[PDB]
């Protein structure tokens, strides 16, 4: 039969009022012969009717995939409401049901530290700017970089890692032309998490 997977919003989207957070229900292994799929959505048991269901799409393995998207309220997701997706298709015995909500546990505030590139990395044309983010719970977090008002995109961030006290840490790495570092340009690491004031903090890094 088909299979159902249910996905939370992006951390940033739940935390920042400029964004629109959504919960996503993906039905896979839908057969060519019966591809009709219905969705029903619920919030703390109460049915809601604002979901938008995509048109089915064929796969490179002869099967279909159907995706439904539900827009949610930031405050609801943050305050622990539960979201249920129910999926209906003839090739099932009965409807499949899946529920999600924000990770549980006592929140703890991230500490954010910027680390300049090593002296030994200066033999290179590009250098690494580092942002250490530690001591946070739950693990849902977003990290970005800017310079001079504008986003910097040439970064990669590790997944959250469990630390010895049961909190989480990660590191983000921004790669920049050595020119820009040595010219004295100012960079910033921005961190979004539920246990920060405004859900947001920014730390600078420069020569």
């Amino acid at each position: 039969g088909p299979s159902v997977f249910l996905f939370p919003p992006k951390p940033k989207d739940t935390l920042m009022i400029s964004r629109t957070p959504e919960v996503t229900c993906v039905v896979v292994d839908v057969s060519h012969e019966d591809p009709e799929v219905k969705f029903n959505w619920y919030v703390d048991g109460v049915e809601v009717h604002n979901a938008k269901t995509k048109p089915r799409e064929e796969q490179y393995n002869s099967t279909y995939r159907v995706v439904s998207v539900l827009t949610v309220l930031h405050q609801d997701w943050l305050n622990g409401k539960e979201y249920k997706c129910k999926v209906s298709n003839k090739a099932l015995p009965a409807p499949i049901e899946k529920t999600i909500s924000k990770a549980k546990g006592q929140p703890r505030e991230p500490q954010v530290y910027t680390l300049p590139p090593s002296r030994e990395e200066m033999t290179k044309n590009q250098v690494s700017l580092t942002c250490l983010v530690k001591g946070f719970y739950p693990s849902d977090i977003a990290v970005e970089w800017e310079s001079n008002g504008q986003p910097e995109n040439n970064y990669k961030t590790t997944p959250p890692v469990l630390d010895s006290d049961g909190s989480f840490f990660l590191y983000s790495k921004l790669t920049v032309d050595k020119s820009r570092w040595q010219q004295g340009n100012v960079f910033s690491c921005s961190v979004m998490h539920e246990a920060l004031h405004n859900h947001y903090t920014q730390k600078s890094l420069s020569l």
Partner: peptide
Amino acid sequence: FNMXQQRRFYXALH
């Protein structure tokens, strides 16, 4: 993003 709207959101969350 708009920082004053973010601050109002966080202050009003409940």
